[PDB]
């Protein structure tokens, strides 16, 4: 999964923590 502070896609649930907002976690 993605880390908070990394980049993740809008609503693809990519992160383990952090909102995927503005193409970032």
Swiss-Prot record:
Disulfide-linked positions: 1-16, 8-20, 15-25
Residues with Cysteine amide modification: 25
Protein's UniProt keywords contain Signal: yes
Subcellular location: Secreted
Any one cellular-component term (Gene Ontology): extracellular region
Residues at the site labelled Key residue for inhibiting Cav2.2/CACNA1B: 3, 9, 11
Mutation effect (residue 3 to G): Small decrease in ability to inhibit Cav2.2/CACNA1B
GO molecular function terms attached to this record: calcium channel regulator activity; ion channel inhibitor activity; toxin activity
Major location (coarse): secreted
Sorted UniProt keywords: Amidation, Calcium channel impairing toxin, Disulfide bond, Ion channel impairing toxin, Knottin, Neurotoxin, Secreted, Signal, Toxin, Voltage-gated calcium channel impairing toxin
Keyword Disulfide bond: yes
Origin superkingdom: Eukaryota
Tissue occurrence: Expressed by the venom duct.
Family: Belongs to the conotoxin O1 superfamily.
Role played: Omega-conotoxins act at presynaptic membranes, they bind and block voltage-gated calcium channels (Cav). This toxin selectively and potently inhibits depolarization-activated rat Cav2.2/CACNA1B currents (IC(50)=89 nM), when coexpressed with alpha-2/delta-1 (CACNA2D1) and beta-3 (CACNB3) subunits. In vivo, is lethal to fish and displays potent analgesic activity in mice pain models of hot plate and acetic acid writhing but has fewer side effects on mouse motor function and lower toxicity in goldfish.
Note: Shows very weak activity on Cav2.1/CACNA1A (27.36% current inhibition at 10 uM) and Cav1.1/CACNA1S (2.82% current inhibition at 10 uM), and no activity on sodium (Nav) and potassium (Kv) channels in rat DRG neurons.
Domain remark from Swiss-Prot or TrEMBL: The presence of a 'disulfide through disulfide knot' structurally defines this protein as a knottin. The cysteine framework is VI/VII (C-C-CC-C-C).
Protein name listed in UniProt: Omega-conotoxin Bu8
Organism: Conus bullatus
Stretch of the intact protein here: 25 to 49 of 50
């Amino acid at each position: 999964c993605k880390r908070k502070g990394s980049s993740c896609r809008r609503t693809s649930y990519d992160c383990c923590t952090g909102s995927c907002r503005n193409g970032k976690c």
